[PDB]
Amino acid sequence: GSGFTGTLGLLRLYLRRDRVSLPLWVLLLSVPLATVYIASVETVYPDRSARAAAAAAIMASPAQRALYGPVYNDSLGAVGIWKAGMFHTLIAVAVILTVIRHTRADEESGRAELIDSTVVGRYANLTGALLLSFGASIATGAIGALGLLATDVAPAGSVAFGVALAASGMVFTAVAAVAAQLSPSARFTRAVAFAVLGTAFALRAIGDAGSGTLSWCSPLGWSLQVRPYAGERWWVLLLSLATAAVLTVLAYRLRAGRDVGAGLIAERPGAGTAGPMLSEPFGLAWRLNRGSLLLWTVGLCLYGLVMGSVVHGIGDQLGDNTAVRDIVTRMGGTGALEQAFLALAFTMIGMVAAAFAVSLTLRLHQEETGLRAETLLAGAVSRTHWLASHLAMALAGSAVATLISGVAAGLAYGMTVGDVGGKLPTVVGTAAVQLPAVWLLSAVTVGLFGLAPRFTPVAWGVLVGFIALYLLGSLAGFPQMLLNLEPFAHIPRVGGGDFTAVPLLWLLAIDAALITLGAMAFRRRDVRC
Amino acid sequence: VPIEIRGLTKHFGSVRALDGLDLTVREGEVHGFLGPNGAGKSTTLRILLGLVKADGGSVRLLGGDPWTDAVDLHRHIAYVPGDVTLWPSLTGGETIDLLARMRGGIDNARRAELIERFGLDPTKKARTYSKGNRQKVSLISALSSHATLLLLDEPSSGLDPLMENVFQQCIGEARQRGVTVLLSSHILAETEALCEKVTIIRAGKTVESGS
Amino acid sequence: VPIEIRGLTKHFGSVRALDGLDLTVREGEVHGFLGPNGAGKSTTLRILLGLVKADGGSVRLLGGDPWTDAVDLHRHIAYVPGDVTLWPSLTGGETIDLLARMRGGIDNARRAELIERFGLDPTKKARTYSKGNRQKVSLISALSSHATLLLLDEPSSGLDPLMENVFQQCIGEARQRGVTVLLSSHILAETEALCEKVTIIRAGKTVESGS
């Protein structure tokens, strides 16, 4: 009987509890490297003279260098792996969630007092979670390295990139393990870990856009100073490992002087009464949603600000029929690529805003299935006064997260060119004309919630189902009749001629009809709980 | 007659007759509603609220019927759920005030003393409340409210015997202001202590009734 | 003597004396453990398990002490929590089989009849279980084991009187196989029905004890 007894049993339990979520992000984060990034770069940039130009173009744009990082030479690997520098961030996100799912938010639920009343040691749970996360990171690194070794690149750089990707996940596994010991609340620990990740990312980006000395002071940044395909600095790797080791030790110490229930931070009281604004199922929805609106709005505004700078410069450092004058001329504005690229770039923001609008409407299904809709509707609340307080939030939140993004992109474009009073109205209109398409997947979700509540989450599968028709229908073969079954293709284009405004009406009518049926079919529906 | 059901019927799958030939009559008193978990007490309480529609029989809540008049009738009614779940980001006082003014006002004088003697702390977030302290929020929100009819459903679940005694005394105080109560307990000791004229149901029917 | 505590003390904040001068002795019987919610029964049960360390006094669980020998002693022990939320993605049978691979041992003959007469469906996911059916999983997992000591804590919460009677009969059957039980009820009717030699604690101390 040791302090580590029951580690393998707990590890087996943790694998089952997420036997489907783990392989998805292990594969979806490692296999789409050699089949998506290097393949596309080889297609677009055939020879060396077309790659030196791209590298020199990247070196004259801090707004584009800070997001991904520098390019040190013009080889196929170094240019094709540049945009993969975001993976180092994504994997970190993943591992953080995993740890906080299995160590905290398992004590908070009360299950890790029932588990600790069986034959398990004091340190079995933390060790099991650490083993799971370290193994997942090593596995995704190995699969990525194999996939890259199955292509035409330097064989000594694929290994370096795989090891860097593994180490960047191990370090943040360690930081998540340390953060899980700090507060009784899982939300607080998630916030702390993500704050550390965010400040690391910002400290990396500031250094990449400038001299480069500051980027050495961030765990992200140690990963891309290994420089795969550009002359590898191997000694950087054991500069991350050491860090992880230290943090891991600290985690165990913070567990050795703690009780199972909670420890190390007290929470904040503060509201003994309800202010004049919590009396309605409209104020309660505002309280339940404001944080997510803030997060999504900031993210979309920042992404639009990033995309606004790139629009000018693409017109020169791209084109010349480098295999982009064929897909941009179809998906985009069919003309001046400075406007075609803008029209193509705002469709991605529209898709992200649609994904945003789906969540605030699934909040309704979460409320009902949590046995709180019965508590609300057992009062003097109309059945349509409720469900008009989450629909309003979804519509009016996705209608501002897109307009703010358009404003940011317009400001960036105007400053880059020098004239802002000309580009800003057109960019704002381009952002605005995407709303009728984004208000589906809210109309659709409401339609499902009221005819078949249990099949409400399939509204995710619809959204993805639309996206695959946009890409795999315009990037591949099409009968032109299977591509007319998505709302993002019919969005007209602002600026110049051939603005029709007819599809907007046909989408607004469908939105209104779907919402009307989803509301009429819900007020004659037995509240199923 | 606040509640008068006779003939209630409902099939859910249309293979699960939950209700066949149910009866109940209340007049201004405390009434005990006894039966197993699958006998249809939850269905009857959820039909009395507008939540579920009945297939047959007459249901008569405070004169009106529960389905169409589900908004006008709910402002003389308080309800305590069987499975109390709260919003994790709101404090106890915030939840109490919100619930109280979504159903027709609150009585601050009664609310203060109820918080004082149930020993609740209305400043911790509802995420931190234990099993016993979660029930106190619902009990305080329901017992301090303009309501001529209380629909309790396992009202004292997780309460130590002292708070059980306090809750019984509060119900006794309420009973002589003219408030009609439904208990639906599952604990026959408190039902015997508080209620007269119980009614026992087996499958969908009422197999016994009376003082 | 499965349990023998005398002198237990513990301050949590170093400002909240939960335990001062606690006493308890059990010998192979059913023992009632009564007191309010803040009196320190939960702290005593979580000190008996290795979860929390004591500041003073003697605690002697099955001969060994609970802190160092928390893995060797937990093999002869079953525990029913006051409040858990079972894993939402696992079925009832899976949960009754995960917790059996970790005490070390289940009795299939007893498990089958316990599932038969508690009327549980061990194929629905634990996310769909109601309040009554969630308690049955813990009760079946604890009552079908190879334990010489059961630490129950509000064992029948959400159970209708029929399942209450079945649980009482099961405890009566277990008591004559030599199994020692701690109830810690909050419902004095079942404590009077099952237990002799109760012990009542007020703040940290035991204010009364005996048959």
From Swiss-Prot, chain A:
Its membrane topology is listed as: Multi-pass membrane protein
GO terms classed as biological process: response to antibiotic
Q: Does the keyword Transmembrane helix apply?
A: yes
Alphabetical UniProt keywords: Antibiotic resistance, Cell inner membrane, Cell membrane, Membrane, Transmembrane, Transmembrane helix
Sorted alphabetically, the Gene Ontology cellular component annotations on this record are:
plasma membrane
Is Transmembrane helix tagged as a keyword?
yes
According to the record, what induces this protein's expression?
Transcriptionally regulated by RaaS (Rv1219c). Expression increases in multidrug-resistant clinical strains (MDR-TB) compared to drug-susceptible strains.
Where are its TM segments located?
A: 20-40, 80-100, 129-149, 159-179, 191-211, 234-254, 294-314, 340-360, 391-411, 431-451, 458-478, 502-522
Intracellular or extracellular location(s) = Cell inner membrane
Q: Which domain of life is it from?
A: Bacteria
Function noted in UniProt: Probably part of the ABC transporter complex Rv1217c-Rv1218c involved in the resistance to a wide range of structurally unrelated drugs. Probably responsible for the translocation of the substrate across the membrane.
Description of how the protein assembles with itself and partners? The complex is probably composed of two ATP-binding proteins (Rv1218c) and a transmembrane protein (Rv1217c).
How is this protein named in the record? Answer: Multidrug efflux system permease protein Rv1217c
Swiss-Prot record, chains B, C:
User: Which controlled-vocabulary keywords does the entry list?
Assistant: Antibiotic resistance, ATP-binding, Cell inner membrane, Cell membrane, Membrane, Nucleotide-binding, Translocase, Transport
* Signal peptide range in chain numbering: none
Q: Name one GO cellular component term.
A: plasma membrane
Q: Name one GO biological process term.
A: response to antibiotic
Q: EC number(s) of the enzyme?
A: 7.6.2.-
Q: In what way does this protein cross or attach to the membrane?
A: Peripheral membrane protein
How does gene deletion manifest? Inactivation of the gene leads to a 4- to 8-fold decrease in minimal inhibitory concentrations (MICs) for ethidium bromide, novobiocins, biarylpiperazines, bisanilopyrimidines, pyrroles and pyridones.
EC class (word): translocase
Q: Where in the cell is it found?
A: Cell inner membrane
| Superkingdom to which the source organism belongs | Bacteria
Q: Where does ATP bind?
A: G35, P36, N37, G38, A39, G40, K41, S42
Q: Which GO terms describe its molecular function?
A: ATP binding; ATP hydrolysis activity
Keyword ATP-binding attached:
yes
Q: What induces it?
A: Transcriptionally regulated by RaaS (Rv1219c). Expression increases in multidrug-resistant clinical strains (MDR-TB) compared to drug-susceptible strains.
Q: Where is the ABC transporter domain?
A: 3-211
Q: Where are the transmembrane segments?
A: none
| Subunit architecture | The complex is probably composed of two ATP-binding proteins (Rv1218c) and a transmembrane protein (Rv1217c).
* Assigned protein family: Belongs to the ABC transporter superfamily.
This molecule's function is given as:
Probably part of the ABC transporter complex Rv1217c-Rv1218c involved in the resistance to a wide range of structurally unrelated drugs. Could be involved in the efflux of substrates belonging to the diverse chemical classes of novobiocins, biarylpiperazines, pyridines, bisanilinopyrimidines, pyrroles and, to a smaller extent, pyrazolones. Probably responsible for energy coupling to the transport system.
What is the protein name given in its UniProt record?
A: Multidrug efflux system ATP-binding protein Rv1218c
Q: What is the lineage of its organism?
A: Bacteria, Bacillati, Actinomycetota, Actinomycetes, Mycobacteriales
Task: State which stretch of the full-length protein is shown.
Answer: 8 to 218 of 311
